[PDB]
Paper text:
These enzymes attach each amino acid to its cognate tRNA, which is transferred to the ribosome to be used as building blocks for protein synthesis.
Importantly, our co-crystal of Hs ProRS with the adenylate analog of Aze-AMP was closely similar to that of Tt ProRS in complex with the Pro-AMP analog. While Hs ProXp-ala hydrolyzes Ala-tRNAPro, it is unable to clear Aze-tRNAPro.
Author numbering:
A (entry chain A), B (entry chain A): 1013 to 1091, 1098 to 1309, 1316 to 1464, 1474 to 1489, 1493 to 1512
Amino acid sequence: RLGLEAKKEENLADWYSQVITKSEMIEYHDISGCYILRPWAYAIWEAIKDFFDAEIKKLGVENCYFPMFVSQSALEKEKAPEVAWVTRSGKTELAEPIAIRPTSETVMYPAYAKWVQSHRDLPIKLNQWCNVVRWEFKHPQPFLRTREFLWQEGHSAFATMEEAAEEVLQILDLYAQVYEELLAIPVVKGRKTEKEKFAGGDYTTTIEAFISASGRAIQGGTSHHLGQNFSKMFEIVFEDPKIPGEKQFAYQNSWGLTTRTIGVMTMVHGDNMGLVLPPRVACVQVVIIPCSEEDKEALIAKCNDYRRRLLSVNIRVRADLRDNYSPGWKFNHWELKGVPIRLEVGPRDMKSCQFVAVRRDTGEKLTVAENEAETKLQAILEDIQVTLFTRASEDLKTHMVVANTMEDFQKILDSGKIVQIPFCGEIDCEDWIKKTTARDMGAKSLCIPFKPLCELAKCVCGKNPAKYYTLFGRSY
Amino acid sequence: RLGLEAKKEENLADWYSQVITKSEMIEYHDISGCYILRPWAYAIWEAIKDFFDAEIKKLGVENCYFPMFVSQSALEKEKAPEVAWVTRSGKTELAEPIAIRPTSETVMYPAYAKWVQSHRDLPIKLNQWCNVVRWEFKHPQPFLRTREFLWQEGHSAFATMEEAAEEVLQILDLYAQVYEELLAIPVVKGRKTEKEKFAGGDYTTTIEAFISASGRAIQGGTSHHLGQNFSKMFEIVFEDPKIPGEKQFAYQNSWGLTTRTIGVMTMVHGDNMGLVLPPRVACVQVVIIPCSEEDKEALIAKCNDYRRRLLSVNIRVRADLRDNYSPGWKFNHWELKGVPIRLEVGPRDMKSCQFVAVRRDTGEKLTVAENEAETKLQAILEDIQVTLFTRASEDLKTHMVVANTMEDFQKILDSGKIVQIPFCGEIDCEDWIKKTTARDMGAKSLCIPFKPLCELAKCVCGKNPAKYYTLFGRSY
Ligand SMILES: Nc1ncnc2c1ncn2[C@@H]1O[C@H](COS(=O)(=O)NC(=O)[C@@H]2CCN2)[C@@H](O)[C@H]1O
Ligand SMILES: Nc1ncnc2c1ncn2[C@@H]1O[C@H](COS(=O)(=O)NC(=O)[C@@H]2CCN2)[C@@H](O)[C@H]1O
Ligand SMILES: [Zn+2]
Ligand SMILES: [Zn+2]
């Protein structure tokens, strides 16, 4: 089949499966929940990596790599169902089983304890780009809920809570920046409830994205304040410089962002014609397509001219000069892959000193003169990035509203919206909301937003007063 | 202890353990054969990555990521003792065991078969930067023989053997370039014998390095011609464009280089004062050390002046302005870490418009005027990189000689040298050489060099004639 079959509003699952394969991003594997990242998908991850990696180095974070294997002893200092266990090498069984990391707290922090003698050893700010395994036996999805996934995990240890408190929001803003400025995805910054917070953590901050096709929200990336909980388990301690004899535990953060990003990018921006790449993230921003043997070679020459002219303005461009494929095949092919701009030039356009420039987001065919080629296209790329963010941003505002009763909350949820409600914060009430909304698949707490829409008031459960406005909704 | 205890010539094992820990490169882990890569070690890998990654993109290779998990079905298409097996997730056991990749041929090539319809789909040139597990139950060493290790693995598929034949040597030259131009390690390019070649491969080319302290050689990185062996196992086939009806198998290469690089860098260049970084690879090329409160702040100002002046010539520099450590502590500290140049400036030097510049390789203390600071230091950095390569290169020539009998071969081997001998290529003779040299730990074939010292003659075993001069020696 040439293009997509299922519409996004018709069958999101089929639509999603078709767009990720037809855009040459994903290939399926014979192990469930594991997917192959083809260059078109991996290039986006590299764009995210290059940005985020450069930004954390300004904050004084340094890259590293810890082992993928965790001892049982290390895991049970903290203490599971998602942890993959290696039990044999070849035919011979191991004396003791060894676990694949779902996260590296128990791997890294024993070494942190050895590196901390005094407060001058702090702060320690380390990051690693690696893979982790979480054997979640649900229905896995490419990018969004994968059994293996690439990510970064940062782990910081400080002398004071206040130092650690500032980094949490610094990192969370960098994640929002990755979602908003790179991927053009609007996000809601907030604190997780007690039920949804990171196990062993003091508090978890999160960025919540909204996938309007499902009417479901998704956790976009979290920054955790572990406090002194992990530094006690592994005895990360230093001499108190203010108090002669006493000993103080290190205040720790951990933070992580994954290849889920690419899945949210696909789900939000993608349309019924295929993938849609934000220019800031697209490895190919512009694709040049040629539209007598001498006249054919002249058409090739014009394309190589436009190619190198765009490279001189650092615009990531590629010329598709393969003569084995027709122009019509190329338009559709690069449509599916979601290249922001198709630079189209035919015999008549070449003669008239111009070319057709097709925007991927709108489908607008703009005729630009050869002299205004490199100034206009970057203006178009910027407008594509802005159009994508604005469209999605307003899509979020429209689908996020306030409700003060469980009755109004239910109907708003049924319309495919997420909604902020007066909430006490207690976990028994949170389970009741999931239970009641499922019977009337259940709605979960997404985050307690830093900037809520309205201000406080009885709780939705109607037993005790409300502590804060909390964002609820159906979720991935 | 302030510095190293064991001498390199005295106890290489203790020396190696002390230099990797005292230079803050390695930290030990509670799983045998697995080691923590601290920033100082990881930064070198990043330098190698940035170079190699940029170079293969010029050749038209694209990055990707395949799953770490391999099905049993996929492994036995090719067909083991080194393969780690996952058998349970949490408390519940998996229906079928799943293996951790020691290499990704069986993971990638089923997908390659699906992507190849016709010859226009070829060539496919893919690379991935990832971790792999080889549960080798020997005595593991940090960097050199690790149970988990970071690497890159490239996998290419072509229409013709000749295309694949050119890439093999292109990639091998890039590995030599990584060893010689980045790490300043001299290497011997050669073809592996039939015994040592990659299982399922047509032929393996290799770069052999020499660690003079042991008198042992080590495999530095290999580029393999898999031929049609793997494309038959997984049915990677396309329509023959020259022959109407017949069907042709894809000609494949695979190639890999690992964090072993850093181990060979440490073993070759390191001395009895600690690590020695080649300037091209050092994340800190120059370290500035300060040597009345107003006069102290003036000394700090001069250091920040030199710092930013070196950043303006893109020299990677850091100022160690920590007042909690003494100058003497800093000299030794950065000596152990092997920073090419210690830029030292004291009160008297500041007054005289000059500074002491200490080379790490030689220990030469050069006084450079403040005006000639940024032109001379880059000349010094270049001379350090050249001095390291030349010293090591001649170290190799001196320890690599020719022998024509088994008698002379034995004594030359006992002097701690590697030696090229007349060899037929057969595996029974190769085992006899390992057996005889062990009793008189055994010597193995290293490579059949492309540029041998001498030219052909009976074999060393003395049964049949010799086919080629082959490099033998004790090995890691
Ligand atoms: N199965 C998954 N597939 C893809 N991404 C996943 C999956 N599970 C969680 N994530 C994403 O990882 C992010 C970070 O995971 S996290 O559990 O919230 N945090 C940690 O593990 C911290 C960092 C080191 N310890 C989440 O925000 C979520 O978006
Ligand atoms: N245990 C090891 N630790 C560190 N490096 C190791 C270890 N075993 C092999 N190596 C290094 O990997 C290199 C590549 O490994 S290789 O076996 O020679 N080749 C492959 O696996 C090919 C690439 C994809 N399939 C070797 O040259 C060797 O120097
Ligand atoms: Zn309540
Ligand atoms: Zn022989």
